[PDB]
Subunit: 349 residues, 2 copies
Amino acid sequence: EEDVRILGYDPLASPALLQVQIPATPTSLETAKRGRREAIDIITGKDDRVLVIVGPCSIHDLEAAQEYALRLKKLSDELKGDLSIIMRAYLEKPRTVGWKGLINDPDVNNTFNINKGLQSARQLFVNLTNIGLPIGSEMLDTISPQYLADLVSFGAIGARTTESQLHRELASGLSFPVGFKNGTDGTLNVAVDACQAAAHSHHFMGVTKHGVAAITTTKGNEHCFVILRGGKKGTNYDAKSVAEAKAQLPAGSNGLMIDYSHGNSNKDFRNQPKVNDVVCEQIANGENAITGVMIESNINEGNQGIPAEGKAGLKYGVSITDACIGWETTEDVLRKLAAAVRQRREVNK
Amino acid sequence: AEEDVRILGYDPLASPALLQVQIPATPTSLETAKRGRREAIDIITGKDDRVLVIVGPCSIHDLEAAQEYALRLKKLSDELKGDLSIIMRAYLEKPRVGWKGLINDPDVNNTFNINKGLQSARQLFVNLTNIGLPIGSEMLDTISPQYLADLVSFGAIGARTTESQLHRELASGLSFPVGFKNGTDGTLNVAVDACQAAAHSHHFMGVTKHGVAAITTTKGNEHCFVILRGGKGTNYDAKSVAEAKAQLPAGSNGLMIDYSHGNSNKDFRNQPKVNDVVCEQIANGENAITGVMIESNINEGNQGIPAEGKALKYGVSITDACIGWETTEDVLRKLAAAVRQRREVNK
Ligand SMILES: [Mn+2]
């Protein structure tokens, strides 16, 4: 007696199969490799620029996500001297009611279609990296990465998974930098331990490119950093917290990342520009522990819901999960930030 | 196309179906597992006035010592079966800088041999359930359960994974009761939300009995309860259980109290104390307290692995500290009485 709570198994196209059906262009693969290099240099102290993971809370519209990417691309060219921008192309959010994500519900209609979900996911990632814009995503499980890893330049383990052994081992084998968010209870200890663990070699059970379960063995990831995203103990994007933080980072730690939205906003997306100001000062005055910022942005501000009128009737450019600043304001943030960096170069010059 | 740069390689892995044939479950084993699930379900849902007790080593690393313990616990289980419903602990590992647990380093010599690990794991579970003693284990990943689910009567999601979506969906499809431990920061909200989620139906990617990745769909598990194990302070006191019962939504199952970890704050000798403070609330008529987790062994304390390998002191855990057998015999006879006395207060 088992599976009594298992309604059934549906066939799942393997990674290898998907990687052929939706191939990565030479440009796409190049953009991904570049992003990883830049990201690595910045978090390890080799580059004085600031790593910026900015983009929608979650993509549900490949059309709108492509428009946004173009804009963000044209900008990244201009502020490339001070900011290395990776676009947020998260494929969901850890809901509890609400949507499931571009992979669980690609059609936004409670009609699960994982296979089509993975196709959209992969297609999307290819479309974005194809125009020369690196992308970052959240590492949900130990399988999804196999279908998209080749195109990702940055990966972030959510706040509710940083303590999870399973996600630490997963990070210890990813081919890019992985950011661990601090505990949902404001503490920074668990994220420091995640980075410690991901640095080691692990032996876990995963699936191959051919959809088969196998004993995986990782090398260890040394490009794991901490992301500050607030918590119960209050937001932590300020100098005082940044210092408490630096104080906890062990020997050989990488540069800290500060997520403007989420716990560092207190259910008010209009606080991101505020945080930017505070963080931009620390930077403008020689703070070199602050290496990257995480921004939840979009084409139009705010959030919304999934109307009774199916997907066909959803305000365009507007998130359907966490709320975010709109384009206009995003470019501001990125210009004061671009300055905070250009400045910083002197404080240390 | 840069990939697998941090992947040293993939080793072949015997599938669940394969393992289930190489190490078959006796008719007795399968019966013991089904019984335990029934009893556990009745107790946490309020249909039975007994107390569910998940007691046993912090983690098994010796199948021979684990078998001796099971015999003792079995006999005791017989004497106090009128009050307690005993489910032996069969954890393969502890919250990871030391031994990686039976599945990973089965030979206890820093070598990774997962296939032999799974064989020991499964063989063990069979040996235990084979003498009529139900077992409970921690649900590590979304694969290991496939190799052992058929023999497990109870499952617990650790404190470091209760917030993990992946483990909530996993629980929503297990064939037995799953206990969620409260956050490591003493809060009880995350565990209440885990239970909420596991109750729903989920669509995740898992592996079949044939080692293949497939889109799994769960029914939802309604036998998910909360376990109080302390945190940043403890929480087995009446003031804490009272604040807990608050947080549980209508129709929630009886809480479970862990006498160890955060509730024994840096010492195993703190379990007997926690048993009084819990036995009391039971005799005084507290009905939310449906079960307890006890970390015991054949001999007190823990230890480590010497310059020498698995020969280690006998009957002693090599991870978290345990109480001895005798202490365990008292602790359980005492918890038994508190159960009878609670039987009156309600009458
Ligand atoms: Mn978000």
